Amino acid sequence: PDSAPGQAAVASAYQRFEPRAYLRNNYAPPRGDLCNPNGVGPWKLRCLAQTFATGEVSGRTLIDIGSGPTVYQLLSACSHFEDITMTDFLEVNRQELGRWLQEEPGAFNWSMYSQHACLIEGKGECWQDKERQLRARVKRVLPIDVHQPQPLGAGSPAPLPADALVSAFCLEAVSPDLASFQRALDHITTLLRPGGHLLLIGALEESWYLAGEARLTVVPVSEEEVREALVRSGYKVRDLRTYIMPAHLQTGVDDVKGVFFAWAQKVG
Amino acid sequence: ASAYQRFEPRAYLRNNYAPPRGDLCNPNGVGPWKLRCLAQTFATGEVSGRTLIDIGSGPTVYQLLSACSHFEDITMTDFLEVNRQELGRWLQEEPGAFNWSMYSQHACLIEGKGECWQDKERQLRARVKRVLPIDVHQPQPLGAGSPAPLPADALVSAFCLEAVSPDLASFQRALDHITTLLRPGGHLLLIGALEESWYLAGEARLTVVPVSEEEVREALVRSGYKVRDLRTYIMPAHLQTGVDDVKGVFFAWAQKV
Numbered sequence A: 001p002d003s004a005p006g007q008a009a010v011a012s013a014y015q016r017f018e019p020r021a022y023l024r025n026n027y028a029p030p031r032g033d034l035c036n037p038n039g040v041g042p043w044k045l046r047c048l049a050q051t052f053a054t055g056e057v058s059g060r061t062l063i064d065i066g067s068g069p070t071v072y073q074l075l076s077a078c079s080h081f082e083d084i085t086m087t088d089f090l091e092v093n094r095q096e097l098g099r100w101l102q103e104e105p106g107a108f109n110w111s112m113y114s115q116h117a118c119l120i121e122g123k124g125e126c127w128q129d130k131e132r133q134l135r136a137r138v139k140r141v142l143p144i145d146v147h148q149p150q151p152l153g154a155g156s157p158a159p160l161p162a163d164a165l166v167s168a169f170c171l172e173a174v175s176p177d178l179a180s181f182q183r184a185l186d187h188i189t190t191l192l193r194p195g196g197h198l199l200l201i202g203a204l205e206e207s208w209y210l211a212g213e214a215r216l217t218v219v220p221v222s223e224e225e226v227r228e229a230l231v232r233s234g235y236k237v238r239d240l241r242t243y244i245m246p247a248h249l250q251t252g253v254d255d256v257k258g259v260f261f262a263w264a265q266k267v268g
Numbered sequence B: 001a002s003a004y005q006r007f008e009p010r011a012y013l014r015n016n017y018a019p020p021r022g023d024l025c026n027p028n029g030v031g032p033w034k035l036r037c038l039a040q041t042f043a044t045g046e047v048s049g050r051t052l053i054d055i056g057s058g059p060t061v062y063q064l065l066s067a068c069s070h071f072e073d074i075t076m077t078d079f080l081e082v083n084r085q086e087l088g089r090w091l092q093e094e095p096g097a098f099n100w101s102m103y104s105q106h107a108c109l110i111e112g113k114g115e116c117w118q119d120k121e122r123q124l125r126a127r128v129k130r131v132l133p134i135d136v137h138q139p140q141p142l143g144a145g146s147p148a149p150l151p152a153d154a155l156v157s158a159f160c161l162e163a164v165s166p167d168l169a170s171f172q173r174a175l176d177h178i179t180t181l182l183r184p185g186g187h188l189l190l191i192g193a194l195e196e197s198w199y200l201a202g203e204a205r206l207t208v209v210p211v212s213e214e215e216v217r218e219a220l221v222r223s224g225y226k227v228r229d230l231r232t233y234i235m236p237a238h239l240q241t242g243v244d245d246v247k248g249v250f251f252a253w254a255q256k257v
């Protein structure tokens, strides 16, 4: 059928996306409490740490798809890639990342996340060093639209194809229905070299979340649907794990039932 | 001794626990070395019990970060009221407290139990039951009827004895005195400056007995300890800052026998 209408709806909804509210909702306590090892925060970081610790995900360039105003998803990644590209649809998010990159006081504080990352990586690294290296290795912050066949546009900056892709809470959050999800996945897959790796994190069975005034509509997806999409796009699924959201972390910022983590390798 | 009446806690913290000495990112610094010594010692599991006393805490708490998960009742002590107040400010999370969070973070890093630094500080604050005056020059350093559970299962002391003793003999006695607070078979973790003769604390200029590792070893033996461990950190040029003339730092793990 037609993809344009659904996309138009999504673009419109995101015009009201408030980064600060989003940050507060998902990365300040209770959800941003990294002290309880059973929490979603530590689980996400652990998934990323453990994956990179295999040494099997490495290369020169990495692209983060739909970064929004967050960097946690790159904390463990940055020691394995010399060149990192962050991306987002919204200017306001790219500016938010801009604040952090200039190490401004007005910037969101990720130090709890950096420290926890250092803690679990177990190399005795101090968090200031981890942050310094991430800031060094982020070579650009670019506009992206995953609904386009060329999500970064034509003749874009990013070194293509990338050795690896990271994406957290983007695809299912910007896709009206499963078919759109699949196409978005196909689009970003063109950015990844054959044999390259994708680390995908996302919400399970979620239909809405809040970003301030904006209450955005999300395609609820299951683990099996995520698996099948990955196979459909030419990936071998190396890892796919599920975190079930504890009642006490279900706070009304959304209706998320769980979180998935996928480590997939593009077939080459 | 009267020199200690001029001792400024803020200037002491600044001189010794703020950059460069207080930058914990470089693992070859004195800070990480000290924390590692304490962490490794407690990780053996051989230093345990219910009560522990920190001798001459001053306004610092780093020396207890790794200890606190092994002792449910902790007594901190200093000779100066201003230091006990400074401790109070951190223990009670009052305004103007010193920021020890980097040290807590690094202890969690080193201990490698995946513990968040806030839980660590929470536990330390919880287990420190009392902050008492003390004078290691007195045969009973805590006095007659102290609220501290005696005898303790374990002792910690860092940069106190050598810093309050005019000479080697005073050092030995101070050590004898504090040893009377320790239950036989108990443990002492002693940290100190090597070959230091002075250090500054704001307007205060303190005199230190310069001691060597062998002199430290011999004193412990004379006080009736079996030295389980004695290590030395040689002070790098870049940490020689004009606040003192320390040449190295020693760490001793001794068991009263």
Ligand SMILES: Nc1ncnc2c1ncn2[C@@H]1O[C@H](CSCC[C@H](N)C(=O)O)[C@@H](O)[C@H]1O
Binding pocket: A014, A017, A026, A065, A066, A067, A068, A069, A070, A073, A088, A089, A090, A093, A144, A145, A146, A147, A167, A168, A169, A170, A173, A174
């Ligand atoms: N068409 C599109 N293509 C790519 N990203 C889009 C998009 N439309 C919206 N987005 C971005 O989708 C993001 C989802 S929020 C996820 C933020 C972050 N990656 C996390 O891990 O918390 C928003 O930042 C939003 O700006």
Ligand SMILES: Nc1ncnc2c1ncn2[C@@H]1O[C@H](CSCC[C@H](N)C(=O)O)[C@@H](O)[C@H]1O
Binding pocket: B004, B007, B055, B056, B057, B058, B059, B060, B063, B078, B079, B080, B083, B134, B135, B136, B137, B157, B158, B159, B160, B163, B164
């Ligand atoms: N007679 C005495 N008995 C016990 N402590 C004394 C003392 N005279 C001075 N002190 C204390 O000795 C401390 C030395 S500074 C050491 C502080 C801390 N333990 C550290 O690891 O940094 C000072 O706080 C000082 O008040």
Ligand SMILES: Nc1nc2ccc(Cl)cc2[nH]1
Binding pocket: A026, A031, A040, A169, A173, A203, A209, A254, A256, A259
């Ligand atoms: N959209 C979205 N971002 C999120 C970040 C964390 C969690 Cl638990 C759920 C989320 N859902």
Ligand SMILES: Nc1nc2ccc(Cl)cc2[nH]1
Binding pocket: B016, B017, B021, B030, B159, B193, B235, B239, B246, B249
């Ligand atoms: N009292 C005292 N604390 C110190 C911490 C570090 C060094 Cl190098 C010397 C010290 N001397």
